[PDB]
Design an enzyme around this catalytic site. Structure first.
Site, short mmCIF file in Angstrom:
data_model
loop_
_atom_site.label_atom_id
_atom_site.label_comp_id
_atom_site.label_asym_id
_atom_site.label_seq_id
_atom_site.Cartn_x
_atom_site.Cartn_y
_atom_site.Cartn_z
N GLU A 63 30.71 37.71 43.61
CA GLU A 63 30.11 36.52 44.20
C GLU A 63 28.65 36.78 44.55
OE1 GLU A 63 32.54 35.63 47.63
OE2 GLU A 63 34.22 34.85 46.47
N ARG B 179 45.38 26.18 44.52
CA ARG B 179 46.49 26.90 45.11
C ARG B 179 47.04 26.06 46.25
NH1 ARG B 179 46.45 32.65 48.49
NH2 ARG B 179 48.68 33.14 48.23
N1 LIG Z 1 46.68 40.66 40.92
C1 LIG Z 1 46.92 39.57 41.65
N2 LIG Z 1 48.07 38.88 41.44
C2 LIG Z 1 48.30 37.79 42.17
N3 LIG Z 1 47.55 37.26 43.14
C3 LIG Z 1 46.42 37.95 43.31
C4 LIG Z 1 46.03 39.08 42.62
N4 LIG Z 1 44.80 39.54 43.07
C5 LIG Z 1 44.48 38.68 44.00
N5 LIG Z 1 45.38 37.66 44.16
C6 LIG Z 1 45.40 36.67 45.22
O1 LIG Z 1 44.22 35.96 45.22
C7 LIG Z 1 44.13 35.37 46.54
C8 LIG Z 1 42.67 35.34 46.93
O2 LIG Z 1 42.03 34.28 46.24
P1 LIG Z 1 40.42 34.37 46.39
O3 LIG Z 1 39.95 35.48 45.55
O4 LIG Z 1 40.01 32.96 45.78
O5 LIG Z 1 39.95 34.51 47.93
C9 LIG Z 1 44.80 36.39 47.48
O6 LIG Z 1 45.98 35.75 48.04
P2 LIG Z 1 46.54 36.31 49.48
O7 LIG Z 1 45.41 36.54 50.60
O8 LIG Z 1 47.43 35.28 50.03
O9 LIG Z 1 47.36 37.66 49.30
C10 LIG Z 1 45.33 37.46 46.53
O10 LIG Z 1 46.66 37.83 46.83
#
Ligand SMILES: Nc1ncnc2c1ncn2[C@@H]1O[C@H](COP(=O)(O)O)[C@@H](OP(=O)(O)O)[C@H]1O
Ligand SMILES: Nc1ncnc2c1ncn2[C@@H]1O[C@H](COP(=O)(O)O)[C@@H](OP(=O)(O)O)[C@H]1O
Ligand SMILES: [Mn+2]
Ligand SMILES: [Mn+2]
Ligand SMILES: [Mn+2]
Ligand SMILES: [Mn+2]
Ligand SMILES: [Mn+2]
Ligand SMILES: [Mn+2]
Lengths: 303, 303
Positions: A44, A128
């Protein structure tokens, strides 16, 4: 057309913008694109949404817009400067690639504007379940302007307004330029999802998108910031651990009012009355990743 | 090297930055440069100092700079984006010319930085008696962030700190790249002043700089914003009306403490004990302009 080493970039190039409300799988999405040999997204930038917001506020103030127009700083001038600024950041803050990409979550509030600045750009709007995103903000203490982490109701209200705006922008840009990508379907069916996504983007299939965890930190692969809050999740393969861990943690009055707090849930196809929904059946690929993750095959990195 | 119609612009081009504390003759200076056939300055862009200040604040915050460096948004990247943004605004908000120029008063707080972004750029720092500038702010009710127009002492204190910083920047950039231009000497001796200034800039002499009032609103001439606060002064020829109209209007306690409130007065060569100083003897040219202005040859424009 400024060069990079030999790749040329310019306002007509095909760019990919990824965004959505934070905690919606935007880092995972851009990591899977980074895995592709033709694409680089990277971390980012943080500053691109900041300068967008400022430039938008200049034109929204009648007084400031008059002063700027009187100075010759018209929308045409503001737009040329925004193009130049954004391209430099996108181009320079990571490795060169044929297709450049940017993930700053809230840029998708401005996808109509960005699609006019960058006429061959496309947009992936991550979607989501608002309940999962808000539960993530609160439990992980993720600081987001406007989101009071002491109130599920407030966060869900802000989530709802945020995705309402971004979804409307997506719809105005149209089916040829913006694709809603559902996080839960990305995790349940990563191959099917990426095949549709790459077809929407006009990019050839590459298996690499299903191997992003092999490519952390490698040349031509997935570059991560040690400070970003999704880094320790995205280093693992696609898995199911985060699909619905919110169930049971939302206050009863918010469960009761879920459809009124967050009407965007049902607009987007989520079941706001189920705790949790059955989101689907996972590919065996993801079932195998998940048990390996939960049993400890992937260690917390020392950094 | 982006084009304009056929003039090419780029980070290596000779740019002129004009600045100083507001109400110091910066509009008159840039109007006299605009009169030259080789130069266009144009109106204050307003946004260039805003984006400078933001970008400087990013790197001054230890926390934000770490996040940006971790994202690949290094100083090299920030600098390339600032160059690109600033060039587009300077290039596009006015007519093309061989030599481009910008006047936003407080950009000269950043002349060291700007001279690194733009290695063949030069700087004109306008210097005017702080008492005349502060009296102008207060009596004309000119809104400047940080300047409390109810207090001569506060405005003189802020004036002093502002010019202290800009003068130090000027000195660090060095005699080959930044020239202090004294407002009072510009008005008393416009021909001698512009001859030195154009020699410092490496630009051939043109009489047009002594005829800026013939060129208001004309192609290749002086473009003005109807909203800017110096517009109705700069449409007149160089004259003496504003040299020392502050005398007698400063509170006695501020006159008493003038040297301690505003030590930069004496640093810059002004007599902080005289009410007012004798700034010099005007050219007959300016004496004739002044009596015509005061007797009413130049009408207030209808707009
Ligand atoms: N390999 C993976 N498989 C599934 N979900 C993943 C992942 N890597 C990251 N995420 C999920 O992506 C979400 C974050 O989204 P962002 O990047 O838009 O902030 C996080 O959810 P959680 O905090 O609920 O665990 C994380 O778990
Ligand atoms: N033709 C002219 N001759 C002399 N001074 C002029 C001028 N046009 C503008 N100025 C002075 O420039 C000062 C404004 O500087 P700036 O453009 O940096 O805000 C104003 O001072 P006063 O407000 O005291 O009259 C104005 O008088
Ligand atoms: Mn790649
Ligand atoms: Mn693999
Ligand atoms: Mn990194
Ligand atoms: Mn000119
Ligand atoms: Mn003339
Ligand atoms: Mn104008």
């Amino acid at each position: 057309e400024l060069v990079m080493v030999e790749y040329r970039y310019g306002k007509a190039m095909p760019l990919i913008f990824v965004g959505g409300v934070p905690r919606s799988g935007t880092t995972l999405m851009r990591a899977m694109l980074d895995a592709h040999p033709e694409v680089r997204c990277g971390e980012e930038t943080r500053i691109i949404p900041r300068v967008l917001a400022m430039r938008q506020a200049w034109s929204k103030s009648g007084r400031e817009k008059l002063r700027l127009d009187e100075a010759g700083v018209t929308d045409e001038v503001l737009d040329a400067a925004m193009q130049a600024f954004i391209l430099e950041v996108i181009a320079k803050h990571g490795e060169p690639a044929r297709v450049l990409c940017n993930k700053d979550p809230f840029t998708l509030k401005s996808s109509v504007y960005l699609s006019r600045l960058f006429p061959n750009s496309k947009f992936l709007l991550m979607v989501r379940d608002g309940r999962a995103s808000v539960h993530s903000m609160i439990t992980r203490k993720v600081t987001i302007a406007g989101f009071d982490l002491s109130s599920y109701r407030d966060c869900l209200t802000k989530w709802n307004k945020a995705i309402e705006v971004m979804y409307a922008q997506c719809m105005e840009v149209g089916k040829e330029k913006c694709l809603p990508v559902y996080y839960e379907q990305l995790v349940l069916h990563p191959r099917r999802s990426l095949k549709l996504i790459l077809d929407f983007l006009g990019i050839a299939w590459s298996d690499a998108v299903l191997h992003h965890e092999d490519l952390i930190g490698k040349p031509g692969g997935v570059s991560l910031s040690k400070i970003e809050r999704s880094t320790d999740q995205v280093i693992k393969p696609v898995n199911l651990e985060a699909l619905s861990k919110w169930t049971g943690h939302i206050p009863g009055d918010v469960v009761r009012d879920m459809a009124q707090i967050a009407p965007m849930l049902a607009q987007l196809g989520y079941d706001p009355y189920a705790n949790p929904p059955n989101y689907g059946n996972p590919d065996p690929f993801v079932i195998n990743n998940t048990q390996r993750v939960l049993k400890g095959d992937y260690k917390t990195p020392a950094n």
